């Protein structure tokens, strides 16, 4: 909790203010500080609230002269860092690098202060609480704040380039993690000026990500363009048009299981979809989608449509037989009931249904064999919650397979009430065909804005519906507890009083009006108010709200359609035979250029 | 009424035009004015329509040379002010200060004219009629128009700094009351350069408001930031990020009962909600809301939801008994009537209802004990009319408590007709759960734009709608007054003819169509025109008006949600136990900095 | 000159006509419709001409 950091900061100000030496270092006044240097009664190695020395204070307040005076007073004092909880290993050389003082950093490296010191405090590790993530190293701080002479001075004074923190990120990862600053891109070249003998570009962190993959997942599009200046080279040009080949070795990532594009499209960050429109990614996945992704996705979409046709014509003809006992009940409808399994398969039409039943059961088996390892391989909250990878549809297809498997369980036990799981499966599965509607460019993002409205608008509006239909349903019920349920029985008991007020809210069921009897006088008053506040006011406010949400999607239609086709292209890249999915790009081993696969695109500029 | 001021202005022009001396002072011609100085037959102390002298006219028309000519001719004439109704104390020094004439002001203070003269007329006091509020003092006029040399000349020539008018405002208040002019802020610095020994910053007006509090209630954001350039100080900086502490002593205002934030959020001025987003105000109420305001508001919201659940399941099971007299009536619905209290509590389920009845009555008591002092402490029109402080919900909760207490009155008197107070209480109280819907950031401003549509759109459209359903209802009644009420009885008598035309306007009830009888030929003509003008034209126009006001709110959603959570945060700051609501901010008495409470925030700039 | 499509510069040239109008006056003579030029500027929507016409009628009495 962040109030502890406030308490530590003004406790630091307390320990500065109590000590005359730390106050003299803060205020930048040499007059009493000379006497503080001269006398041996005072202790120069005194601690702050955290462990900040006088050198830490004089580095923090841009006071180089008092800092250098106390380094002539104590040359050994520079190497000791802080030792409390928010600053576990903070040296003042980190502060002087971060404040971009060239003379103070030069004096600190001239007196032999530590350059490989890890500042492993909680303030320097990344969090929503800390406003910056500058790293844990001085070379990290120098390359991350945007200073050139300081970082080259740190190169010439030791400071080995490979520096993995507690998160395991090196300098390039947390040079990428800045909020899209252009000039640090050039300073990336400075790091690539001094990377020598694997290389720094290929070392992963504790998450297991290449810096190129970190630029992919974090949405740093300017750094992605700067990185693909190095990989590409033009092979010929004529007139306005150039042809250049991009290296897809770390785009496709054929050796690695967890691919680069899987890190791009399943990123939690919103800005990681503008990197998916770039010049070596868009042409590659467009070639994958047009050459392979759309035909295999279309034949799987036709196969699932035919599977649901073969399921609905199987469950329409379900075993049903006439009930043995008579009805003898007013307010009741029943002609026929469920059929026992001993007579459910007696004719040829029952066998034609039965082979369809085995088709549906093996369809459930091949659905859950394609989801349970897939939900295990990435996690539950990663895959169900992601709207780009079809997670709301992938919980629906799993619910289908569990429901029709439960229907097969219930049928062999020969117990009744199989209308309910068959009805949920039959209504959820035909809505899962929208999962196969992401492939078409015409009707693609309509399915993403439908789920966007379900999870955005109608999760906030459902609680404002349930304070109106509950109150008005309860108000309509009291006016018709006194009266009869025969002439006007739309509010007879309270569940149908809720349901009728819900339908009257939705303007589907007509208003409860029996003009052949005298209605209660309160009912017209409390229903006129309902027609004002609910059918007129509350509903069409939500309808215009849906229109605003539809406008919000429709300004960015292609940006989500391309993300949807990337998600399904890399999902059909996995789970599919290798002979039926050859490697995208052209090989280049027979062209003598190496065992790296490339992609040639040609453009047209002035 | 403002035509009197026009009559006074042209009567002033009359009294200028009749007198040759005042005409010569207006026209700035010295030729006959020399003879007017020379002769003793004319009276130099003559009056205008109000009391304006000729030196008043020469100050009014930037005629400094003629003013100095009669000012050598009459040195004592400068001190007399005007003496009729709109200018009861206006001197010419006020006019010369207001017109920024440096030489005339220097001459007027050189001849000993009064500098503490109070111009307490109706034109100088604030009103919608007067276009400016420059104050009542010369120092007021000089600071308020924004002239530096004039106000410093007034400081060196007397003019004590504390100058409270008939409204009681000093100079700083009516420097703040300007229409957001930036440069007067620097003029404010001049006053705070010359304020010495309480101070001028802490003296209140007759309303009882600090100039800090007047800056808060008037929405002057630039003055508010300029005031907090003095209060704040940075305690440390490193790299891009500074940590600074703000003084919340006059923000939280712990000693004063009527707090500062209560003056900000209950301000009638629209521009006082952009000052609620400022850099220590947003963080203070966000700390109050996240640390305390949201959990106690959520547990009160759950307690009120459970209280309404325990009230609706109490009144659904209300006592009713089978009636003794038989129906014997066509066009009537009745099975059963209300139950007497002597048999209303006979079983264990009646006792389970009865403890819920005492829960609801004590809930009404603890509601009206939390509203009647609260409506008395701020007034009726201040609290019910303010839409930010939940006033439309606070009249609804009061109406609920009065209605269920009227139910408690009616039930012990054992008289019938108790369906109506339960029906009004049960429709109003579940709509008051929207009052607890202001807390959530997801579903917050929906409940403010619903009341915005009720009080904006359906106040104007109902008068346009009650001249269509009245005329068409009367037109439908005449076409079916000739006919029967059995085969088509939707317009049998005139109340249900109004109600059916209302429902047909809302398109809930179907059109009156009985195809098994010959309808009147006028009815199809006057119902086809109804389907044009009412169902098609006026309804969907009002839907488009809802779309426009929905867009108008949705551009400024967060600005009202933050004001709503400020309103409920300062409502739960009051009326709640002190041990459960500690003082927000950190103490600082143990940090030796004084008995003032602060708030440290850190920012991130370049 | 009023019937132009809202051209500003002939406004000043209107002053030229009122520089040489002498002895009723040209400002008050009507057409066959029976309209004053002030009324023609009113009915044709020439707002710049109307403002320029109201520069001459108005005068400030105090400031
Ligand atoms: C279908 C069954 C449910 C599927 C479960 C998986 C459901 C699912 O995939 O979304 C998770 C959703 C949060 O959405 P999620 O984490 O994906 O992130 C939001 C998403 O990107 C929306 O599209 C964004 O627009 P909007 O503002 O929303 O318009 C929204 O804001 P922004 O990016 O524009 O700034 C993003 O925050 O949480 C629920 O409401 C579910 C409650 C019901 C849980 C019911 C549990 C059964
Ligand atoms: C719930 C029971 C009634 C609660 C009583 C308290 C009702 C209440 O709190 O509002 C008072 C309201 C005036 O609204 P009010 O004084 O608060 O000021 C208006 C308010 O700020 C609106 O939100 C603004 O938008 P809109 O243009 O409106 O969209 C409007 O214009 P603007 O700021 O945008 O320029 C502001 O003028 O007057 C009535 O219509 C009530 C008639 C029915 C009186 C019924 C008396 C029982």
From Swiss-Prot, chain C:
Family: Belongs to the transient receptor (TC 1.A.4) family. TrpV subfamily. TRPV5 sub-subfamily.
Assembly and binders: Homotetramer. Probably forms heterotetramers with TRPV6. Interacts with TRPV6. Interacts with S100A10 and probably with the ANAX2-S100A10 heterotetramer. The interaction with S100A10 is required for the trafficking to the plasma membrane. Interacts with calmodulin. Interacts with BSPRY, which results in its inactivation.
PTMs per UniProt: Glycosylated.
Subcellular compartments: Cell membrane; Apical cell membrane
Residues of the full protein shown: 203 to 269 of 730
The organism's place on the tree of life at top rank: Eukaryota
General function of this protein: Constitutively active calcium selective cation channel thought to be involved in Ca(2+) reabsorption in kidney and intestine. Required for normal Ca(2+) reabsorption in the kidney distal convoluted tubules. The channel is activated by low internal calcium level and the current exhibits an inward rectification. A Ca(2+)-dependent feedback regulation includes fast channel inactivation and slow current decay. Heteromeric assembly with TRPV6 seems to modify channel properties. TRPV5-TRPV6 heteromultimeric concatemers exhibit voltage-dependent gating.
Annotated source species: Oryctolagus cuniculus
Extent of the ANK repeats: 1-23, 33-62
Tissue-level expression: Detected in kidney cortex, in distal convoluted tubules and cortical collecting ducts (at protein level). Detected in duodenum, jejunum, ileum, kidney and placenta.
Stretches assigned to coiled coil: none
Lineage summary: Eukaryota, Metazoa, Chordata, Craniata, Vertebrata
Protein name as it appears in the record: Transient receptor potential cation channel subfamily V member 5
């Amino acid at each position: 909790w962040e109030q502890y950091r406030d308490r530590v900061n003004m406790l630091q100000q307390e320990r500065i203010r109590d000590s005359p030496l730390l106050q003299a270092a803060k205020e930048n006044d040499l007059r009493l500080l000379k006497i503080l240097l001269l006398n041996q009664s005072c202790d120069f190695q005194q601690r702050g609230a955290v462990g900040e020395t006088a050198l830490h204070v004089a580095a923090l307040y841009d006071n180089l002269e008092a800092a250098t005076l106390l380094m002539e007073a104590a040359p050994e004092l520079a190497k000791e860092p802080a030792l409390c909880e928010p600053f576990v290993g903070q040296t003042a050389l980190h502060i002087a690098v971060m404040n971009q003082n060239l003379n103070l950093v030069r004096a600190l490296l001239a007196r032999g202060a530590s350059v490989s010191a890890r500042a492993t405090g909680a303030a320097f590790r990344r969090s929503p609480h800390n406003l910056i993530y500058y790293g844990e190293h001085p070379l990290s701080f120098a390359a991350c704040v945007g200073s050139e002479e300081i970082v080259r001075l740190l190169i010439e004074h030791g400071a080995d380039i490979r520096a993995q923190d507690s998160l395991g990120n090196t300098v390039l990862h947390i040079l990428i993690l800045q909020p899209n600053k252009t000039f640090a891109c050039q300073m990336y070249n400075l790091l690539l000026s001094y990377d020598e003998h694997q290389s720094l570009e290929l070392v992963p962190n504790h998450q297991g990500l290449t810096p190129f993959k970190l630029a992919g997942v974090e949405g740093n599009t300017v750094m992605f363009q700067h990185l693909m200046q190095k990989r590409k080279h033009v092979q010929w040009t004529c007139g306005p048009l150039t042809s250049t080949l991009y290296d897809l070795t770390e785009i496709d990532s054929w050796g690695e299981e967890l691919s680069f594009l899987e890190l791009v499209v399943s990123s939690k960050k919103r800005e990681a979809r503008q990197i998916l429109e770039q010049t070596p990614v868009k042409e590659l996945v467009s070639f994958k989608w047009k050459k392979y992704g759309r035909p295999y996705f279309c034949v799987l979409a036709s196969l699932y449509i035919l599977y649901m046709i073969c399921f609905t014509t199987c469950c329409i003809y379900r075993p049903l037989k006439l009930r043995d006992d008579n009805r003898t009940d007013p307010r009741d409808i029943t002609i026929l009931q469920q059929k026992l399994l001993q007579e459910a398969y007696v004719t040829h039409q029952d066998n034609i249904r039965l082979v369809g039943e085995l088709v549906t059961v093996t369809g459930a088996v091949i659905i859950l064999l394609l989801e349970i390892p897939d939900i295990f391989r990435v996690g539950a909250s990663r895959y169900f919650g992601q709207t780009i990878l079809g997670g709301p549809f992938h919980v629906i297809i799993i619910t289908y397979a569990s429901l029709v498997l439960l229907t097969m369980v219930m049928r062999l036990t020969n117990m009744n009430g199989e209308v309910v799981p068959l009805s949920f499966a039959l209504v959820l599965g035909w809505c899962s065909v929208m999962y196969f509607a992401r492939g078409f460019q015409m009707l693609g993002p309509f399915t993403i804005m439908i789920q966007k409205m379900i999870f955005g608008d109608l999760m906030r509006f459902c609680w404002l519906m349930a304070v109106v239909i509950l109150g008005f349903a309860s108000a309509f019920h009291i006016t018709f507890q006194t009266e009869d349920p025969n002439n006007l029985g739309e509010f007879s008991d309270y569940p149908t009083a809720l349901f009728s007020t819900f339908e009257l809210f939705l303007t589907i069921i007509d208003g409860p009006a029996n003009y052949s009897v005298d209605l209660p006088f309160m009912y017209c008053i409390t229903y006129a108010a309902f027609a004002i506040i609910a059918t007129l006011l509350m509903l069409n406010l939500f309808i215009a709200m849906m229109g605003d949400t539809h406008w919000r999607v429709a300004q960015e239609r292609d940006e989500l359609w391309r993300a949807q086709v990337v998600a399904t292209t890399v999902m059909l890249e996995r789970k599919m035979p290798r002979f039926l999915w050859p490697r995208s790009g052209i090989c280049g081993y027979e062209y003598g250029l190496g065992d790296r696969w490339f992609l040639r695109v040609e453009n047209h500029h002035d």
